[PDB]
Amino acid sequence: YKGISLNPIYAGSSAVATVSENGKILATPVLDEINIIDLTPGSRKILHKISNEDEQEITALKLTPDGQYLTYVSQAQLLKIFHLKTGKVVRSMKISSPSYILDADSTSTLLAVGGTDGSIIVVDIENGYITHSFKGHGGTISSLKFYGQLNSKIWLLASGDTNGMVKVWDLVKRKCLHTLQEHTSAVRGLDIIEVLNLLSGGRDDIINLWDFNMKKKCKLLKTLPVNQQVESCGFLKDGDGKRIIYTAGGDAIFQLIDSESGSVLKRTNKPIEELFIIGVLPILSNSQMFLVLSDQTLQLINVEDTIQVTSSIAGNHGIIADMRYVGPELNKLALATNSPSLRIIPVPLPLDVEIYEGHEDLLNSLDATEDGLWIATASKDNTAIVWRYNENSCKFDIYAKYIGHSAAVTAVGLPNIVSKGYPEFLLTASNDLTIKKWIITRHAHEKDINALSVSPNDSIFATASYDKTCKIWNLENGELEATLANHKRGLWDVSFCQYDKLLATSSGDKTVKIWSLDTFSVMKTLEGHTNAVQRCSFINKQKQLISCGADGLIKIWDCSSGECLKTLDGHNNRLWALSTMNDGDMIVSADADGVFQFWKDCEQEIEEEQEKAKLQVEQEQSLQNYMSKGDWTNAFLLAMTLDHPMRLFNVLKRA
């Protein structure tokens, strides 16, 4: 089978990705690697991943405003500076202190690192030698800031202490110019603005402004409060007169406020997501911003009381509960993750995500229509919201909503929708036995209900659970038809065979049972797995039934056979989300990891087998006719290609 793997981009380590001044570039830390991606409109690709050591994780990394170097500190107290052109590390040297803040100048010659011990260093970039070391304050640094003019002879250095003090140094004098104690918390945001004036964001409430001179002339220009914990801050020239102040603060709120007045001028949005904006990557020339967010996401922003976001990209789809196919074109993918938003990805490189937040808790379960436009997302919140998507311009409508029962709706199922697209009913299942069926209500499973299954003819419904029993009933009523009543240790998954008209049960142990809908009996039993199948799926061909597996693998058998046909082992740890496109019969699998794989059979292997056998036949007959006629050159060529030593030696004898 062909298999296409997609990997998590911004995963694992909590180190902010860096870009250059151009937007066609980015570099993310996964748990041990820094994967660098060229970010073009459309042609977003990957250059290369760097694989220094899987033991240590990258503490921090920095990419200069030109795509020329990557300077990164791993877990060990040492920096590695990396040439981007050659794709090779330039230098590496230790620092004896875990660094956390890396500030490069706009010019690509000078960089500074600062960590926890209090001492920081400024180092040259083109030659990795420390220009000078500042002992700094007696506190863990939280932010750095430069003042880079291209043609001048003075550069500045502001430190953000964990204490409420900024130490502005000289660099051509290597002298602490001023020490301004104003905050009560760590200075997370820093900014140096041209005349001098100064800005400093302390995480408690504060955005300080300082009138400043190289001499002793420094006082408080102003101080600004924000209704959040400020994570980063700075200036923007839009509004040349009222030089606006941008503030990326904890509740994922990126405000634009005035310098002259304390009033806000422009907020972005109030996210239902309770996600910390882990920073902003400004451009300040393209009026573009990259709001990097603790759900490993980035927000393209254009700047001129809400901000219309320019774009949204993900860098991770970490833990995925379920995969679904969206669109009559079947190109979008519904991602039921452990996040309170259905994630839409496209089927193909960094793929932008489309997040739909309908509830505040994670998507417990998912179902969708074969004909596209209707979705049903059930949360760990007690809601089960049924959605219109429209195959035109990407609208998401959550007009349909079920308050349901008073428990976590662990499952939602739909057999068929009317041609009006008017949802008739949904079957909602919970962690407890508050299972019901809600139009646009039974009690069977003592243990937790594990799975649903829809009969495609809108006839019957079968449900697996942990108490080794599945229930089959009529869809229109709540009257129970029958019970599959037995297994060893539980049941994980059920699936209806429509062209075969059967039932499949991934059990709680390492096996699967096939049930005839006629006899209500064990039609077949399938073994061969190790720990937990958790997903028994029907192939589009309705012969090669698939089982995923929590050991991290895939194993497939013909339904009529009972012997496992093939086995794929792409994922590492587990395997949770499993789906299949039918028109192109493509198996799609997602583990607990952020890695993913497409799969598809091809009979071209059989075609090529026929062709190579044909070619063997033809050249064999050519060799035999040569053994008749002569042309011992061509005969010997054929004998070498055929590895026929007797005939070859005969050719040599004749020659």
Binding site: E182, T184, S185, R203, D204, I206, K222, T223, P225, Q229, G262, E274, L275, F276, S294, D295, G318, I319, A321, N338, S339, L362, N364, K380, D448, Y466, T530, N531, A532, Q534, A550, D551, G552, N573
Partner: protein
């Protein structure tokens, strides 16, 4: 174990994404001992957040810290000693603290335990002049004489009960005569056990006479002014 052959259970069916940012939402708070100690500035604690000042206050009032007198007073002779305190009041990243209890270390107790002598314990129950209900555990050992030819040093139960009564009298008298901070100052230079030693000097030669443990049982009503006094007012910064 999280191995691939670790057999799956119910367990991590539904989990979450590590986005809480605990060490950024948390806040360090320096606790500080009463004025009876040398190094009052010892130890900073982390408050979970800052939006709930109420939560900060109740958590810091529920904090029961412990320290040793060695690191408290710079004299590492009192490494075996250990006390518990509790932050009673807060003031702008600085937290007033007050005494709560006392004990030794188990290895000290074990080393003091020997095989050829008798251990006596006194467990008195008392209330101070500061109305702090308290329970005191003290211990001592039956040493031998310099002239002792005997392998052991064992005394009569009459001596045991007499010395017990003597000790408990000493404790009750001294505590009822004392207040809380006065008891702490008495507690510091081990003078009380020396007093008991000079009292029991006529009955029997003893050794390793030590107050083992202190148990706060009840505390009286709240007095922030008294706490500020025993520890040793504030304007703002004109934010605009």
């Amino acid at each position: 174990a999280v191995g691939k052959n670790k057999r799956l259970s119910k367990g991590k069916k539904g989990q979450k994404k590590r986005v809480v940012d605990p060490f950024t939402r948390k806040e360090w708070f320096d606790i500080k001992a009463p004025s009876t100690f040398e190094n009052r500035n010892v130890g900073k604690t982390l408050v979970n957040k800052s939006t709930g000042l109420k939560s900060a206050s109740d958590a810091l009032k529920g904090r029961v810290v412990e320290v040793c007198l060695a690191d408290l007073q710079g004299s590492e002779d009192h490494s075996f000693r250990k006390i518990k305190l509790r932050v009673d009041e807060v003031q702008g990243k600085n937290l007033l603290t007050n005494f709560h209890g006392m004990d030794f270390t188990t290895d000290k107790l074990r080393s003091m335990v020997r095989k050829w002598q008798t251990l006596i314990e006194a467990n008195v129950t008392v209330k101070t002049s500061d109305d702090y209900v308290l329970r005191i555990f003290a211990i001592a050992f039956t040493r031998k004489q310099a002239n002792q030819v005997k392998r052991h040093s064992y005394a009569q139960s009459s001596h045991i009960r007499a010395i017990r009564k003597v000790i408990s009298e000493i404790l009750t008298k001294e505590v009822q005569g004392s207040t809380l901070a006065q008891l702490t100052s008495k507690l510091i230079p081990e003078v009380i056990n020396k007093e008991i030693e000079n009292a029991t000097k006529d009955i029997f030669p003893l050794q390793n006479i030590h107050v083992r443990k202190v148990k706060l049982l009840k505390q009286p009503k709240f007095d922030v002014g008294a706490l500020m006094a025993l520890h040793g007012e504030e304007k703002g910064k004109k934010v605009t």
